[PDB]
């Protein structure tokens, strides 16, 4: 809620497409985070196709710039609403206004040089309140093609990794919903077939000494990019028709 | 920018301040007078410097 | 109108409160402007850039 | 795995090793200067103000 | 020379109190004011919600039946929950609630060690009359501010994925402001009187707070001083 | 530590021969043919080389004399 | 429970009477606390004797001049404001000067008392030209606290506390496992009547005696 607004905030909030504007007013019958169910008044109701209105909100989903576009209900149970009145605040909207950021107590003074050229200096009272903590959604993808050396697999068995690295996977080789991963964790265990190793001298000596077979496959699994974190919230499996669907699919 | 503002505030003189026209034995008790709050940051003062 | 709205509150008309440093605990000379600015977090976050 | 023993090693390899800092419109020859690194809890290069 | 001594504590309304401290000499008013202000405001022992386990929730980016809130606004309503613990350092509270209406901290289960200081702090609203919310809250004594990104090193085998780590703001204080004004003394002309107004969430009584703060300060100075 | 290289510029001039001399010296101290002629303060061989320049006991001339002396000792150690 | 306290590390005396004391293991923000607290107690409230009364043999009232002295009495007393005198086991003492001839009147020429020590016998007071004017004065210092003029007390304006400068810096210190913490650096200049470790020690003693009453273990 920008304390210093210009009055153009409600037009940008309502007349964009992010919030859910009521098309027929009435009494609010049901409020959930997923949906808002409106009982239409008698005079605003058509004679045929009587019904009541239902507004399916869009929950945590991916925007094009990797931010999280979300809708949240701002009306409660049993409340009179007008036609053309906001019901569900979108991203950066409070009560049908436009809240692009947050309002904070500011002091204009040079404070020990930490604000030297144009720099801002923030107290811990902001970061303890999580009032600038934002939510990003990334979409990592793992394709599994068909090479001319053989097809790739989405099996959980991976050569030369630990069991503790694979404990965050299922029996099907695709990560569970809601396991906090860090940089380097394996989300989709995928191995590609290879052959014709062309081993050297003393590496071939070592293989001979210890008898360990150089395997016919290579770890090309999907991994988290270097240096992020967060939660796996949604997993999709697209499969070509005519191919065996595995268990998690 | 910040440093030249800190200097231009630090080396100036107003005609009346705390410790107006007192005498000082050196820079060290200038710092002891400013940081105790008896004398102001800028007041014209005879000091002894080497 | 800003002055007349500040007079409705208990705030000073000049809009500048005296402030105390968090470390030395002593008053800043020349009382400073504090207020409420609506500020925005732009999406040039550092961990995407580094 | 970033075990706790490597940070003393990294503090040994930094100590007297200058890095080169560079801003992209490098017009005159003061655009590339060396510094000695002090390690920072953070993700932003701290750059001396007078420079 | 002349040492201080504490005098009347005035709980103003409910949770913020003015502590007077009368016999102080020149300069020690502002000195102990700044010092006690900082040590009360930064590092006091307190407890806040660390781990939350809602029943039918995989992870905090989701939604539940009948709750008009999202899950992370439930978690941000639990972050502000002010609670105190008597004889433990971590303790597991729980919620079981059904039916239409608000769900506050008064509906958290009963325990003799745990005292709730605000029964009206609203956690979450329920709508569908059948959607029963049931969670297990883990509160924990701590110090300062530890975010959820710092605690996950050993991770305590987080494979029970229903655990939701909440940033724990352990600090019970919110605002400490002191005045220094002169106390009129019988023969000595000027002796400064300190008044430390302190706003807390309600968990810490003021005399124990200032006693802990002065204890920590004297423990810091006794590195090169000694017993007296 | 070594914040400015000014004293080494006053001992060895030209500001560019200093780099080559200190480089040759620090290679003599890193590749283990020698060992430092000044007490090290956990500095790297760069700073130890510059400190050996500032004490005056290393320049191009002294290094040339020492290198020819090592070659003469090799010629005596052929046996 | 992480209340980890520091320990004193090498008090680096630079030349004569002023020392740099660092203090490495401090938590977040305690550096400025201890710096401000020790700083204000040292700089404001120390038990310390300063120049109380200085009585010259041949000066009637303090607006005068003397034979052979190139100055008048007031800038001489301004010189005497920086006189550093320590009193070891007394609460009252009277020393005296006797200087003849052409030359500076030093603090070395003040009479010998085995307890009361002038840390700088070279401390110049005034200069002489006559060679027939034997300057002699009697000096009593008496203990005080802070800054007091003669308005509450030849009577001499003064400045009590033995410290000359206290400046601290708080800078980040890496600990073996811990993330980042503060490090305190107190550089302190005294006049020499008190060696600096005893100055910081008395400061901490005064602060702990202030916190003696309502803190307890």
Query: Reading across the β-sheet that carries E164-165, which strands appear in turn?
Result: E90-97, E133-143, E45-54, E164-165
Distance CA(F25)–CA(F47), nearest Å, equals 11
Taking every pair of Cα atoms in chain B, the longest distance, rounded to a whole number of angstroms, is 33
CA E221 to chain centroid, in Å, comes to: 26
Mutate to test the interface with E, among A28, A31, A33, A55 (most CBs of E within 10 A): A33
Taking every pair of Cα atoms in chain E, the longest distance, rounded to a whole number of angstroms, is 74
Residue C22 with chain E: CB contacts under 8 Å? 38
Pair of tokens at residue A26: 């009435």
Q: What is the CATH number of the domain that holds A215?
A: 2.40.50.150
Determine contact, residues A181/A230, Cβ cutoff 8 Å.
yes
**CATH H-level superfamily of G1-47+161-217:** RNA polymerase, RBP11-like subunit (3.30.1360.10)
Distance CA(A46)–CA(A41), nearest Å, equals 10
Alpha-carbon separation of residue A218 from A62, A173, A191 (angstroms): 32, 15, 5
Distance CA(A225)–CA(A184), nearest Å, equals 7
Q: Which residues pair with A169 in a beta bridge?
A: A175
Domain E46-170 CATH (choose: 3.40.640.10, 2.60.40.1930, 3.90.950.10, 2.170.120.12): 2.170.120.12
Alpha-carbon separation of residue E90 from E84, E85, E142, E209, G3 (angstroms): 11, 8, 9, 20, 19
Pair of tokens at residue A249: 């699919």
Using H for helix, E for strand and C for coil, what is the string for chain E? CCCCCEEEEEECCCCEEEEEEEEECCCHHHHHHHHHHHHHHHCCEEEEEEEEEECCCCCCCCCCCCECCCHHHHHHHHHCCCEEECCCCEEEEEEEECCCEEEEHHHECCCCCEEECCCCCEEEEECCCCCCEEEEEEEEEEECEECHHHHCCCCCCCCCCCCEECCEECCCEEEEEEEEEEECCCCCCCEEEEEEEEEECCCCCHHHHHHHHHHHHHHHHCCCCCCC
Pair of tokens at residue E19: 């502590």
Q: Residue F54's CB: how many other CB atoms inside 10 A?
A: 19
Distance CA(E94)–CA(E84), nearest Å, equals 15
Answer whether E225 touches G (CB < 8 Å): yes
Nearest to G29 by CA among E151, A124, E48, E222: A124
Q: At G210, phi and psi to the nearest 5?
A: -65, -35
Pair of tokens at residue G5: 């306290």
Listed by start position, the domains of chain G span: 1-47+161-217, 48-160
Pair of tokens at residue A95: 């009560």
Determine contact, residues E117/E203, Cβ cutoff 8 Å.
yes
Is A125 strand, coil or helix? helix
List the helix and strand counts (H, then E) for chain A.
Answer: 4, 16
- 């708080």: which residue's tokens? G170
Distance CA(B22)–CA(B20), nearest Å, equals 6
Pair of tokens at residue G42: 């040292």
Answer whether C21 touches G (CB < 8 Å): no
Distance CA(A16)–CA(A92), nearest Å, equals 12
Using H for helix, E for strand and C for coil, what is the string for chain F? CCCCCHHHHHHCCCCCHHHHHHHHHHHHHHCCCCCCCCCCCCCCHHHHHHHHHHCCCCCHHHHHHHHHHHHHHHHHCCC
Distance CA(F27)–CA(F9), nearest Å, equals 20
Please report how the helices E206-221 and E28-42 are oriented relative to each other, as an axis angle in degrees rounded to 10: 100
Alpha-carbon separation of residue E188 from A174, E191, G48, G161 (angstroms): 80, 7, 20, 22
Q: Quote the DSSP letter at residue A153.
A: B
Do E and F touch, counting CB pairs below 8 Å (3 needed)? no
**Structural domains counted in chain F:** 1
**DSSP string of B1-50, one letter each residue:** -HHHHHHHHHS---SS-TTTT-EESSHHHHHHHHHHTSS-SS---EE---
Q: Are strands E6-11 and G181-190 parallel, antiparallel or unpaired?
A: unpaired
Nearest to A123 by CA among A105, A108, A138, A149: A105
- Contacting residues for C39 by C-beta, under 8 A, at least 6 apart: A101, A102, A103, A104, A106
Q: At G19, phi and psi to the nearest 5?
A: -130, 145
Distance CA(E96)–CA(G89), nearest Å, equals 75
| G174-213 residues touching D, CB cutoff 8 A | 174, 176-177, 179-180
Closest to G204 (Cβ–Cβ): which among E3, E21, E225? E225
Per-residue exposure over E155-174, b if at least 16 CB sit within 10 Å of its own CB, e if not: eeeeeebbbbbbbbbbbbbe
| G1-20 residues touching E, CB cutoff 8 A | 1-3, 5-8
Sign of the dihedral through C-alpha G39, G44, G47, G53: positive
Q: Which residues pair with G22 in a beta bridge?
A: G185
Pair of tokens at residue G137: 């004065």
Determine contact, residues E71/E54, Cβ cutoff 8 Å.
yes
- The answer to whether the Cβ–Cβ distance between E76 and A130 falls below 8 Å is yes
Q: Which residues pair with E180 in a beta bridge?
A: E194
Nearest to A246 by CA among A142, A154, A141: A154
Beta-carbon pairs below 8 A across chains A and B: 9
Do G and B touch, counting CB pairs below 8 Å (3 needed)? yes
Pair of tokens at residue A159: 């050569």
Domain containing A178 equals 134-249
The CA angle D5-D6-D9, to the nearest 5 degrees, is 105
Determine contact, residues F1/F49, Cβ cutoff 8 Å.
no
- Contacting residues for E125 by C-beta, under 8 A, at least 6 apart: A76, E67, E68, E69, E101, E102, E103
Distance CA(D11)–CA(D37), nearest Å, equals 10
Residue D11 with chain G: CB contacts under 8 Å? 174
Give the DSSP H or E segment for A106: strand A102-107
Determine contact, residues C5/C15, Cβ cutoff 8 Å.
no
Q: Are strands B46-47 and B23-24 parallel, antiparallel or unpaired?
A: parallel
Task: Assign residue G192 a region (left: φ > 0; alpha: ψ between -120 and 50; beta: otherwise).
Answer: left
Pair of tokens at residue G14: 């630079």
- 């809601």: which residue's tokens? A178
Q: Residue G152's CB: how many other CB atoms inside 10 A?
A: 6
Q: Scanning every residue of chain E, which has its alpha carbon at the shortest distance from the alpha carbon of G211?
A: E214
Same CATH topology for E1-45+171-228 and E46-170: the answer is no
Query: Reading across the β-sheet that carries A20-21, which strands appear in turn?
Result: A20-21, A86-89, A72-73
Do F and G touch, counting CB pairs below 8 Å (3 needed)? no
Alpha-carbon separation of residue A210 from A160, A201, A207, E184 (angstroms): 16, 15, 5, 91
CA E179 to chain centroid, in Å, comes to: 23
In angstroms, this model's resolution equals 3.8
| Length of chain C as a residue count | 50
Determine contact, residues G26/G183, Cβ cutoff 8 Å.
yes
Is D31 strand, coil or helix? helix
Domain containing F21 equals 1-79
Per-residue exposure over E33-42, b if at least 16 CB sit within 10 Å of its own CB, e if not: bbbbbbbbbb
Alpha-carbon separation of residue A125 from E141, E145, F38 (angstroms): 20, 10, 51
- Contacting residues for A109 by C-beta, under 8 A, at least 6 apart: C19, C28, C32
Q: For domain G48-160, is the CATH number 2.170.120.12?
A: yes
Residue A116 with chain B: CB contacts under 8 Å? 1-2
Q: Which long-range contacts (CB under 8 A, 24 or more apart) does C40-43 make?
A: C40/A100, C40/A101, C41/A101, C41/A132, C41/A134, C43/A65, C43/A67
Alpha-carbon separation of residue A28 from A57, A80, C10 (angstroms): 15, 7, 41
Q: At A138, phi and psi to the nearest 5?
A: -105, 155
Q: At A174, phi and psi to the nearest 5?
A: -130, 135
Pair of tokens at residue G144: 């005080």
Dihedral angle computed from the Cα positions of residues F10, F13, F15 and F21, in that order, rounded to the nearest 10 degrees = -100
- 């505030």: which residue's tokens? B9
Please report how the helices G30-44 and G196-210 are oriented relative to each other, as an axis angle in degrees rounded to 10: 100
Q: What is the CATH number of the domain that holds F64?
A: 3.90.940.10
Decide: residue E112, CB within 10 A, 0-12 exposed, 13-18 middle, 19+ buried: exposed
Q: Which residues pair with A26 in a beta bridge?
A: A40, A81
Determine contact, residues E115/E87, Cβ cutoff 8 Å.
no
Alpha-carbon separation of residue F18 from F21, F46, F58 (angstroms): 5, 12, 11
* Percent composition of chain A: helix, strand, coil (DSSP 3-state, to 5): 10, 25, 65
CA G173 to chain centroid, in Å, comes to: 32
Per-residue exposure over E181-201, b if at least 16 CB sit within 10 Å of its own CB, e if not: eebeeeeeeebbbbbbbbebb
| Residue A51 C-beta-side C-alpha neighbours within 13 Å | 8
Is D11 strand, coil or helix? helix
- 């920072």: which residue's tokens? D40
CATH domain E1-45+171-228 topology:
Gyrase A; domain 2 (3.30.1360)
Answer whether D42 touches B (CB < 8 Å): no
Q: Which long-range contacts (CB under 8 A, 24 or more apart) does C13-21 make?
A: C19/A107, C19/A109
Q: At D33, phi and psi to the nearest 5?
A: -135, 155
Determine contact, residues A90/A60, Cβ cutoff 8 Å.
no
Determine contact, residues A220/A161, Cβ cutoff 8 Å.
no
Decide: residue D3, CB within 10 A, 0-12 exposed, 13-18 middle, 19+ buried: exposed
| Residue E37 C-beta-side C-alpha neighbours within 13 Å | 26
Please report how the helices B27-36 and G30-44 are oriented relative to each other, as an axis angle in degrees rounded to 10: 110
Determine contact, residues G9/E225, Cβ cutoff 8 Å.
no
* Percent composition of chain G: helix, strand, coil (DSSP 3-state, to 5): 20, 30, 50
Which method was it determined by?
cryo-EM
Distance CA(E54)–CA(A3), nearest Å, equals 36
Dihedral angle computed from the Cα positions of residues E52, E53, E55 and E61, in that order, rounded to the nearest 10 degrees = 70
Distance CA(G139)–CA(G87), nearest Å, equals 13
Task: Assign residue B26 a region (left: φ > 0; alpha: ψ between -120 and 50; beta: otherwise).
Answer: left
Give the DSSP H or E segment for A217: strand A217-219
Query: Reading across the β-sheet that carries C16-17, which strands appear in turn?
Result: A102-107, C32-39, C16-17
Q: At A206, phi and psi to the nearest 5?
A: -60, -40
Distance CA(G136)–CA(G156), nearest Å, equals 17
Task: Assign residue A49 a region (left: φ > 0; alpha: ψ between -120 and 50; beta: otherwise).
Answer: left
Distance CA(A107)–CA(G194), nearest Å, equals 43
Closest to B25 (Cβ–Cβ): which among G82, G147, G163? G82
Distance CA(E221)–CA(G201), nearest Å, equals 10
- 């200038």: which residue's tokens? B30
CA E164 to chain centroid, in Å, comes to: 20
Distance CA(E107)–CA(E114), nearest Å, equals 13
| Residue G69 C-beta-side C-alpha neighbours within 13 Å | 21
Q: Are strands E133-143 and E164-165 parallel, antiparallel or unpaired?
A: unpaired
Determine contact, residues E177/E197, Cβ cutoff 8 Å.
yes
Determine contact, residues G118/G64, Cβ cutoff 8 Å.
no
Alpha-carbon separation of residue G125 from B26, G77, G81, G99, G137 (angstroms): 16, 8, 10, 11, 11
Q: Quote the DSSP letter at residue A162.
A: -
Distance CA(C26)–CA(C42), nearest Å, equals 35
The CA angle C46-C47-C50, to the nearest 5 degrees, is 80
Residue A231 with chain E: CB contacts under 8 Å? 59-61
Chains with ≥3 CB–CB distances under 8 Å to C: A, D, E, G
- Contacting residues for G182 by C-beta, under 8 A, at least 6 apart: G26, G27, G28, G29, G30, G31, G170, G171, G172, G173
Nearest to E135 by CA among E213, E75, E225, E46: E75
Q: Measured between CA atoms, how close is C21 to chain G, in angstroms?
A: 11
Decide: residue F14, CB within 10 A, 0-12 exposed, 13-18 middle, 19+ buried: exposed
Q: Which parts of chain A fold into alpha helices (H)? A: 9-14, 124-128, 163-166, 202-210
């Amino acid at each position: 809620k920008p304390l210093v607004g210009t009055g153009m905030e409600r037009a940008v909030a309502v007349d964009s497409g992010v919030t859910a504007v009521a098309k027929r007013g009435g009494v609010v019958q049901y409020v959930d985070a997923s949906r808002i169910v409106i009982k239409v008044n008698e005079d605003e109701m058509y004679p045929g196709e009587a019904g009541i209105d239902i507004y399916n909100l869009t929950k945590y989903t991916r925007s094009n710039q990797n931010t999280c576009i979300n809708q949240m209900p701002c009306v409660s149970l049993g409340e009179p609403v007008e036609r053309g009145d906001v019901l569900a605040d979108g991203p950066s909207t409070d009560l049908g206004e436009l809240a692009l950021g947050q309002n904070m107590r500011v002091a204009f003074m040079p404070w020990n040089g930490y604000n030297f050229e144009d720099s801002i200096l923030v107290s811990e009272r902001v970061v303890q309140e999580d009032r600038f903590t934002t939510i990003h959604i990334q979409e990592l993808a793992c394709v599994s093609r068909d090479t001319k050396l053989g097809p790739e697999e989405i099996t959980a068995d991976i050569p030369n990794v630990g069991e503790a690295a694979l404990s965050k996977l299922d029996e099907s080789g695709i990560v569970y919903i809601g396991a906090e991963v860090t940089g380097g964790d394996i989300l989709v265990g995928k191995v590609t077939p290879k052959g014709e190793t062309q081993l050297t001298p003393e590496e071939k000596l070592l293989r001979a000494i210890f008898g360990e077979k150089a395997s016919d496959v290579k770890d090309s699994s999907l991994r988290v990019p270097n240096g992020v974190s967060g939660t796996v919230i949604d997993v999709q499996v697209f499969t070509r028709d005519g191919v065996e669907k595995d268990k998690r699919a | 920018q910040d440093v030249v503002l800190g200097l231009y505030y630090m080396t100036r003189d107003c005609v009346n301040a705390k410790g107006e026209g007192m005498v000082l034995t050196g820079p060290k008790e200038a710092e002891r007078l400013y940081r105790s709050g008896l004398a102001s940051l800028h007041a014209r003062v005879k000091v002894r410097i080497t | 109108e800003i002055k007349e709205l500040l007079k409705l509150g208990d705030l000073p008309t000049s809009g500048q409160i005296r402030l105390y440093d968090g470390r030395t605990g002593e008053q800043f000379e020349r009382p400073v402007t504090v207020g409420y600015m609506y500020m925005l977090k732009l999406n040039h976050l550092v961990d995407d850039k580094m | 795995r970033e075990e706790a023993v490597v940070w003393d090693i990294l503090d040994e390899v930094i100590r007297e090793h200058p890095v080169l800092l560079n801003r992209a419109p490098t017009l005159h020859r003061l655009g590339i200067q060396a510094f000695e690194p002090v390690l920072i809890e953070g993700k932003a290069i701290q750059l001396h103000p007078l420079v | 020379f002349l040492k201080p001594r504490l005098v009347d504590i005035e709980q103003v309304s409910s949770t913020h109190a003015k502590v007077t401290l009368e016999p102080l000499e020149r300069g020690f008013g502002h000195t102990l004011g700044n010092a006690l202000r900082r040590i009360l405001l930064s590092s006091m022992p307190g407890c806040a919600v660390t781990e939350v386990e809602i029943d039918g929730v995989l992870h905090e980016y989701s939604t539940k039946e009948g709750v008009q809130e999202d899950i992370l606004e439930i978690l941000l309503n639990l972050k502000g929950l002010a609670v105190r613990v008597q004889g433990k350092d971590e303790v597991i509270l729980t919620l079981n609630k059904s039916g239409i209406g608000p769900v506050t901290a008064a509906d958290i289960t009963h325990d003799g060690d745990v005292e709730i200081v605000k029964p009206q702090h609203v956690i979450c609203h329920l709508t569908d009359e059948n959607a029963s919310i049931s969670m297990r809250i883990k509160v924990q004594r701590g110090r300062g501010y530890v975010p959820a990104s710092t605690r996950i090193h050993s991770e305590e085998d987080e494979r029970p994925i229903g655990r939701l780590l909440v940033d724990a703001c352990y600090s019970p204080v919110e605002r400490i402001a002191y005045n220094v004004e002169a106390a009129r003394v019988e023969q000595r002309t000027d002796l400064d009187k300190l008044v430390i107004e302190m706003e807390t969430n309600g968990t810490i009584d003021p005399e124990e707070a200032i006693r802990r703060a002065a204890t920590i300060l004297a423990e810091q100075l006794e590195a090169f001083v000694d017993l007296e | 530590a070594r914040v400015t290289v000014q004293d080494a510029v006053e001992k060895i001039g030209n500001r560019f021969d200093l780099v080559l001399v200190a480089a040759r010296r620090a290679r003599q101290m890193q590749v283990g043919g020698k060992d430092p002629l000044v007490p090290e303060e956990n500095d790297k061989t760069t700073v130890i080389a510059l400190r050996e320049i500032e004490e005056g006991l290393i320049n191009n001339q002294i290094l040339d004399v020492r290198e020819r002396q090592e070659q003469q000792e090799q010629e005596a150690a052929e046996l």
